[PDB]
Structures are given as C-alpha cells and as structure tokens.
C-alpha cells in the first residue's frame, strides 16, 4: 500500500502513463495526472480515480517539451498534492526514419521530451524529496535506452540518456531516502505501438494481427505485449520498502528482448 | 499472494535463503528448504514456517556441490510438495585471495555450487514447469555477476556466468509461462560478509563497525546494507503476474554499486 | 596506413581531437580540423600537419552546437577534401553541479555539443559514405556512456545517448562497408580534466599533482591517465581493414574504471 | 611490431588460434601453439611459422581441461620462449541442447576449457608478467559472453565467466604493466561454427552455403562473417603501447550482433 502517498505521472491520458497513475490510485496514492487528449476523456479520468479509489486526483495541462513549463508544472503538482513523494517520468513520443532522412525538427522533439523534460522534472522534484528525506523518481525508458535498432536514432539516443540520467540521480542522492531507477520496457500495444504495427502491415501487405506478431518476433523472445498492468505493478514494487536498496538500475520488463 | 505455490529455496538455513524461505512461506507458499548448519536451528526453522505461516515446510539436505545429489534434490523437493512452481537457485560460498594465490580447490568449489548447482537445479526443475506452463526461476547472482572486485576471480566468474545462464533459461523457455530472473544484490549483512568485514578491521586496525562501514563506502554508494527482507520481497515480486513478461533479465538491489 | 583517405575530426583544436587529428596525419590520411582557439595556434596546427606529415589538412571553424553550422561544416569538409571517408565526432564540454543546481543553459549545451551534434554531423556524412561503400563515423564518447557519477547529469545523459546512437548509426548501415564505433575514455589530462584537478585541489586544500592523483585513484584502477595518443591509435585501429566487423560498439580505454 | 615478444596461444592448431598465432609471429614474436589435430599439420604449423616469419615456434601437446596440465603447459611454454609476455586464452569448444537434455559431461567439459582454462592458465601466467612489469593477456570470449542465445547454456555460462574473469585480473594487476581484456567475436567460419551450418542445413533442407546465410542473418546484421585474420589484427592491437590503458574490458568484433 502506498497510502497517503502523492503521486506525480506525465503523460498519463493515456497508455502506459494511464495504467501507471491507476495503480498508484489503487494501492492508495492521490494521483497529478498530464497529457494530452480529448477533455471529456481527460475529466472522466481524473473523477473516476477519485469515485473508483477514493484518493484525490488533479489534471494538470502541460507541455513538457519546455523547460520552464515542466519546472512549474512540477510545482503546481507538489501545491496541488500537498506534497510530492513519487514521480514517474514516463510520457514520451516516438517516430521512425533511418539518419540521414530523420527531420532535425523531430530529433528535437523527441530529446526535449523523452530526455530533456526527465532532466527538468527531476531538478524540479529534488528539493521536495530531500527535504522529507524520501522519496521515488521511477523514469519510464525502454528496452532501446539498452539497445538499438534501426530507424530509432533520436528516441534510441533519449532512451539511452534517460539509463544515464537515473544512474546520476540515483548517486546524487544516495542513501537520502530517495530512489531512481528506470523501467526499460519491451513493446506494449498502446498507440505509440499502433502506429509501427500498422506501418509493417502497409509495408507488408498483411492484416493488422498478423503485422503485430511479426512485430513481436522480431524482437521479444516471449511472442507476448507486455501489459500496462504489469508496467504499473512494477512502478508499486519500485515505490515498496523492498526496493528501498534498489537505486540508480534498470528494471527490464521485455519478454526476454534484451537477454539476446 | 502466492497461495498454493510451491517453492524450493537452495541454501535457506542461513542468510539471504532463509529470508527467502519466509518470505515465500508468508506470501502462502510451501517450501522446501535446504542447507547446512545445526541440526536443532534446522528443525526449528522448518517447523516455524509452519507454525507462523500455516503452510507446510521439508528440509531436504544436499551438497549441492555434487550434480547428482542437485539432481536427486529437486526430484526428491517436487516429490515432496506435490509439484515446483519456483525454484530459488541461493546457495552460494566465497573466497578472497588474488588469482595466483587462489587455491584451486576453492575455485572447483565456488564454480561448482555458485554457476553448476544452478545449472543442474534448473534442468531438473524445469520439465516440471514446462509440464504445467507455468514456473519462475529465481537465480541469486550478485553484483560481482555484471562488475568485478579484485581477489575475487572464481565467484566474479561464477557469479557472470549465473546471469549468462539467466538469459539462455529464460530465451529457451519464453512464452512458455516460466520465466528466469538473476537477482543481483550488493552487501547485505549476512556471514559470507561478516567475515570479510572481519579480515578488514583485521587489516585496518580498526573495530568491527567502522570496517563495516568502510566496505560499505568502497562499493555501496547509499552506505547502507541490502536487506535478506528487502531480497525476499524482491523474489515475491518476480514471482507475481506483473513479472509475467520479466524474463532473462537482472534485478539489481545494490545501494548503487553498478550504477557507477 | 590510411594513405588517400579523408578524414574530418571534430573539435581538432585541443586536447584528444589534436590527437586524433596528428594521428591520421601521419597515418597518410587528408584532415579537416574544427575547434575553438587561438588562430595563431591553429593556423600552426594546420600547416604543421602537412608540413610534417605530407598530407592536405584546412581549418573549417563551425560552432556544432548549431544544427545547421554541423551539417553546412560536414559539406564544406567534403568539398574541401574531395571526399569524406572517416569521421570523428569528438568536440564536446564537461560542466558539474548537483542536477538541482545545474544549469538549464548548460545542460542544454552539453546536450546540443555532445549529443546533437554526433548526430547533425553523421547525418550529413553519412550519404557520402553509402554512396562510396565505405566509411567510418568514430564517435568518442566517455567512460560516462557506459556509467555514471555525480554532478554530471547533463553529461552522462548526453554520453550514454551517444553510445545509443552509436549503436543505431551501426545498425542502419550494417554490411555496406560503413562502421560506427564509440570511443570511451577514462581519466585524459586535457583542460577539460584540469579544471576538475584544480576545483578538486581548491576543495581539499592540496596541490595539483595530489589533486590529480586523487582524481585517478577515486575512478581509474591504473592510476595512469590515459593519453591522447593512446586514443589517436585506437582510432587508427577502428580505422583499419581488421575492424571492418567492428561496429555498434564501444572500445574502452579507462584503466579498468568500467571492469569496477 | 612486437619483436622478440614471446607469444602463447591455447588452441592454435585450428580456426581463430592459428591466426592468432600467425599475426602474432607475422609481428615478430616468437610462438607456442597447442591443440589437437593431426601431426603433420601441426608441425608444418610449427615450422612454417619459422620459415615464413623468422621467429621461434614451439608445439606444446596438453589437453587445457586439466587443470594441471593447464598449469605446467605454461611453465613448459615459458621455459621454451625464455619468458612469457603475451598469453592468448583461445581454446574452446560449443554444444548445442537445451537446458534439461543438455549432457552433465558436455556441461564440465565447456567449463572446464572455455572457463577453467583461463583461470589456470592465468593464474600460471600472472608470477612472470608480475615479474616483469609488463604483460597481455588476451582471452577469447564471444559475444556470448555479453548476451545469450538458446540451446548454449554451457557455452553462454562460460563465456560470461570468462568476461568477469577478465575485469578480476585487470583490477588485480591494474598499473603493474599488465592488461587483461576479453575479444568477443561473433560468427567466424571455423569447423565449430560449420558443424552449427550443417544442422541447420540438415534441420531446414537446404544447401550449405544458404544455411550459412540464414546462421549470419539471425544474429549478425553485417550479414558478413567476422574472419580469424581480423581477429588476429585485434590482438596485435592489443599488444600495442596504444592499448597499454585498455584493461578489462571486452572487444566486440561482431558485425552489429550486440548493438541490437
Ligand atoms: N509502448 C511501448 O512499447 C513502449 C516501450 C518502451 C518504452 N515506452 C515508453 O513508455 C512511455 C509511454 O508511452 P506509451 O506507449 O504509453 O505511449 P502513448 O502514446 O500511448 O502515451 C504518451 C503519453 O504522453 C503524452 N504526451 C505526449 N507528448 C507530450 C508532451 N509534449 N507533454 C506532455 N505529455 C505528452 C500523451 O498525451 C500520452 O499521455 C514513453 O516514454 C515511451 O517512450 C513505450
Ligand atoms: N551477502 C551478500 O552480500 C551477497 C551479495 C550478493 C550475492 N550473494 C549471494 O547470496 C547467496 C546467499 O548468500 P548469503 O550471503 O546468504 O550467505 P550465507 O553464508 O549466510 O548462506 C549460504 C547458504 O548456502 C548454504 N550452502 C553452502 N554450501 C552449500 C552446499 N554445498 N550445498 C547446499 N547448501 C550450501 C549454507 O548452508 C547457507 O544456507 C549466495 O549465492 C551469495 O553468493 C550474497
Ligand atoms: N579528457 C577526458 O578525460 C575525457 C574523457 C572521456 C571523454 N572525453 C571526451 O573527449 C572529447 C574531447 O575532449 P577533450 O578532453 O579533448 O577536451 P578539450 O577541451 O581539450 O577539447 C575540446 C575540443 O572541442 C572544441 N569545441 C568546444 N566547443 C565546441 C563547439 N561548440 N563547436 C566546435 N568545437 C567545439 C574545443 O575548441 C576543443 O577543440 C569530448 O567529447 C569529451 O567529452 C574526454
Ligand atoms: N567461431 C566462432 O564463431 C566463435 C565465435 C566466438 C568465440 N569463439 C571462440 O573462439 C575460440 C576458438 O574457436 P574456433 O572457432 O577457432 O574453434 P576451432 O574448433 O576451429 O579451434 C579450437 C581450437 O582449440 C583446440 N582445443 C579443443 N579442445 C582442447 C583442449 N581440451 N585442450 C587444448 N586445445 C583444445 C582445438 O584443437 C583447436 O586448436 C573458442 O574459445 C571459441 O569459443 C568462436
Ligand atoms: C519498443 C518501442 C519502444 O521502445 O518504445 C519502440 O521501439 O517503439
Ligand atoms: C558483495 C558480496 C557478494 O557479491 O556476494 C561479496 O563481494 O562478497
Ligand atoms: C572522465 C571525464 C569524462 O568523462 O570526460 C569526466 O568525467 O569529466
Ligand atoms: C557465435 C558462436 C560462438 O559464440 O562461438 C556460437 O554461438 O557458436
Ligand atoms: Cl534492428
Ligand atoms: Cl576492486
Ligand atoms: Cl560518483
Ligand atoms: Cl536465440
Ligand atoms: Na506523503
Ligand atoms: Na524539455
Ligand atoms: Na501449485
Ligand atoms: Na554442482
Ligand atoms: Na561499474
Ligand atoms: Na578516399
Ligand atoms: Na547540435
Ligand atoms: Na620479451
Ligand atoms: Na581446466
Ligand atoms: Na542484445
């Protein structure tokens, strides 16, 4: 249980980041939740947090591909929760173009976003954390902040500098309370998976099923998605006293991509 | 929970094993436990985890340094719970001396219990697994299988080639329902550690606690000790549906050792 | 001997990139140099080159912390060579402070220097080489792609992302005679290390040299640094025909700081 | 050059050992080679490596799964070269099961050469170097020393052992002059690797040469074969002053197989 916690995740309208804000709920946790979407979905969101796990949520619009946007959205969370004891930097975009023809325009939005706006997040929750003396910053990466491949440059580059960073956060802060670690999934069929499952159906001329299992072999030994469930189950383990030791490491929920 | 489960846990008399044992057995688990020490303890300690826990609980003794005896274990441990749903492969000893001076007989030792008894374990639990399509096996690596120390060599290699070992279990046996994890910890206080501290404050002059505190500074960045709790609680994660597609991979509770 | 090829290195002024610089010099290879300094320095540097070694070598200044200037500097490097056969993406900054405290500027400088560039640079290089069949793109990265310590986020970040993009650039051009390889030094006495050495004797109190050998026994087993030519050779050998199957990967001369 | 360097090579009587020890005699050193085979080859070997080279080669018959043997080949190689400066840890054999079918003995025989091998033949090796103040010693890894594939438990077991092994004794003999670091190749086309082409060939029912290729596209994305030549290139640079601070650490000459 995690009750009376305050929980911070980005992008949580939708995917993963949904799945994460909803266990937290679950296991206690008043929730911040960000990201975009439709706002009757968005409202229907938070309430239901609220009127399914009797906690507290709040919405808080930001674009986290700024800076300054990301460091007051991390205070207005902290003034809305009363607090800020876990914050899951998890929202992210993806998209798919060998080097020499990936727009410069999309490198630096996948850096500001899935890299930079990790960076700021952090800076910005720090002081709260160390003041209390405690404190979880659980960074959403991927099996691709461990390894390559082709097409992947930019969003390969930021998952791999998101490893580099929670190593450094974990060390700045080590035996103050506070934990980083990054959870490195392997694919997990939300839209940002969608997208690469209908391109491979076009460029193969196969139905939408068929192109996700060749998706899955390719890569994840298992032929199995990982679940946002099981991703949201990994977040609570993280924010447990049990991984109150586990710091500055990498937790690969793959299906057995990277042990190849 | 883990109502129902049955678990063996290698070299559960003492240490990081034991608190696997009852973790296991508090989460609803029988359990075979395994090891050498005083044969009053043993006996208490089997007869506790069912008394405190309410489940049932065998000690079966191996030296698990023989294949055989390893192999007969695991057949006698299923024999024993009606089934083998987790296999926690823990046993392990050390021996610190550099590679010129390292007796060969402590290297045909380390290499034998800490990399052949979880190969041999692993093959006779496994067509049990496989028969039921479902099964976790917990292998108890250490840091010193992704980093080294000096004077260290045959567990440093030993403890390398148990992750190595992880992944081909894991890749052998993927969608099968069974997964492979390597459980990687730091210093934890246990007698493997005690006396290694002792042979610094030996060395250094120095009292028991302030060794302890220096080799924890050496390599833990949190200079705090991992738990045989925290441990257990991590093994209870990687046994739950949200490590369902955890496999092959490493879960590191090292204080930050490898992230530097 | 790399006799007839073009090499461009980046960040050539100082320091490693010099290194790299005189080292394909004398190998036979035609150089393209880039960097800040004094231009009496760099004039010397340029001329000397080819005075010394026989080769062609032009100074082209272009700030790489600029998308646009990498990519105009890789084109005026390819006209002025009459080709464009090894790249080495090395200039790069070092800036340390807690994350809390460190700046946005520079974080965003570091990530633009060190990470953006690697990538504007072999994006540009790269159709030259597929369209020759042949090419090397060395990227020097850091022990610091591999690991991480304190008060470098920014750093680590941008040094593990380019060990990511490494492995992508590899990847992409796996087979067409191209290889991307990292680079990733330990401890080098350049002045981007002496103003470490000098923060660090300030800290404590102690001269320079003790500073230094602080700096090398906290991170770096040999308690040597690493020198310059030592790197400009490795960079000779990724060069060469037997490492036409070395790629996606990173060579490490660090002392053993990365075997820890 | 490494003239009058002297050169031990286990397992240098096929595959990637002769090449080693050719590259090395091609540099000047004198050679001990060792390994089954058939007499007259293995003494057309010997002396054609002084006829071509001009430099002295020994044939030492010893079988390195034995430890003893492992223990006074060495002193019988250094009492032929009248030293020993660089030591290539090359033999090793493959077989391929799955875990619960693999054989016991297939299982001590792979870890007897391809891990306890380099542990003996390193601990022998270590007193002259140490002596001397300046050493290489070179071990044959693969890349399944840093990931895995099915059916190669043992193989996989002992290659990672063979990498942690490799960190322990660069540490131990950090700036004494010595380095030890670990050659991960992928696929090279030697009759351990051809006999894998022909049961793929028998299992697909199709040609050699159409096997080969299918072998090289499921791991290797050059797609091209890693050959003993370029391999023999890597540990001449090892020996190299450019390589004096490249200690403990792995050089993957893989054609892509880790960078994904
Ligand atoms: N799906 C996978 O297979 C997979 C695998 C590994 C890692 N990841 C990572 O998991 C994370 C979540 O991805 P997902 O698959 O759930 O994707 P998703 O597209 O379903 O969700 C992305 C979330 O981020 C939000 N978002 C996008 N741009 C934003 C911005 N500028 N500011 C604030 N919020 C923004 C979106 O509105 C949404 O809430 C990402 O970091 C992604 O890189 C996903
Ligand atoms: N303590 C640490 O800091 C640490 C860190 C990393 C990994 N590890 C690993 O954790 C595991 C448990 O170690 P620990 O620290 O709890 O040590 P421990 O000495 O307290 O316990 C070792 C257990 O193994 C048993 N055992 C020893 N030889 C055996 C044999 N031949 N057959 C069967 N059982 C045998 C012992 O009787 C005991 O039950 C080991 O694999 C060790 O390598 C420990
Ligand atoms: N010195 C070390 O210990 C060490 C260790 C690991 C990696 N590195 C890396 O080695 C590389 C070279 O560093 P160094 O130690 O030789 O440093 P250095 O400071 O001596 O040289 C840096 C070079 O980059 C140039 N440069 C700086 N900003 C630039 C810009 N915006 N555009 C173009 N050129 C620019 C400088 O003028 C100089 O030529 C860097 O990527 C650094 O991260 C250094
Ligand atoms: N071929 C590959 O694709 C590949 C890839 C990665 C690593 N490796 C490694 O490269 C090394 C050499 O393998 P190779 O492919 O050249 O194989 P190979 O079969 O062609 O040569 C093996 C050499 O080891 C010798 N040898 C075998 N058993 C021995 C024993 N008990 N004592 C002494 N010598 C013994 C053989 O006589 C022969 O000289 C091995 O360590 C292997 O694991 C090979
Ligand atoms: C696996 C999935 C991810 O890393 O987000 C992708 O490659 O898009
Ligand atoms: C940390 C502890 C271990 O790995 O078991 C040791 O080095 O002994
Ligand atoms: C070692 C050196 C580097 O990575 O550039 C540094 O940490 O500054
Ligand atoms: C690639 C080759 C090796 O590692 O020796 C093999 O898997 O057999
Ligand atoms: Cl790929
Ligand atoms: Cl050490
Ligand atoms: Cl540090
Ligand atoms: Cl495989
Ligand atoms: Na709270
Ligand atoms: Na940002
Ligand atoms: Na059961
Ligand atoms: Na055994
Ligand atoms: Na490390
Ligand atoms: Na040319
Ligand atoms: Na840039
Ligand atoms: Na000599
Ligand atoms: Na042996
Ligand atoms: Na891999």
Redesign the interface.
Known sequence: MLKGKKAVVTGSTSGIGLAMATELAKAGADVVINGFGQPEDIERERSTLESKFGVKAYYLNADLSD?QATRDFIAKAAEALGGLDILVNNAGIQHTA???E?P?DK??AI?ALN??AV??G???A??IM?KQGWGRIINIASA??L????????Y?????????????????N??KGITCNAICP?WVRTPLVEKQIEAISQQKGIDIEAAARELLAEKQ???????P??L???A??LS??????????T??????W???
Do not use: Y
Not at 147 to 154: E, G, I, P, R
Not at 240 to 249: I, K, L, N, P, V
């Open positions: 800076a060998p080097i020499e990936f410069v490198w630096n850096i890299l930079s960076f700021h952090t800076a910005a720090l002081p160390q691709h902040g390894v390559a491949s082709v097409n992947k440059s930019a390969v580059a930021a998952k791999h500098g998101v490893v580099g960073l929670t190593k450094v956060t974990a060390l700045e080590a035996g392997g030994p298992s032929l199995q998605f990982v679940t469930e099981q949201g189950g990994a609570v383990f447990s006293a049990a991984a109150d030791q586990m710091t500055g490491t937790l690969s929920l793959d299906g057995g990277t042990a190849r």
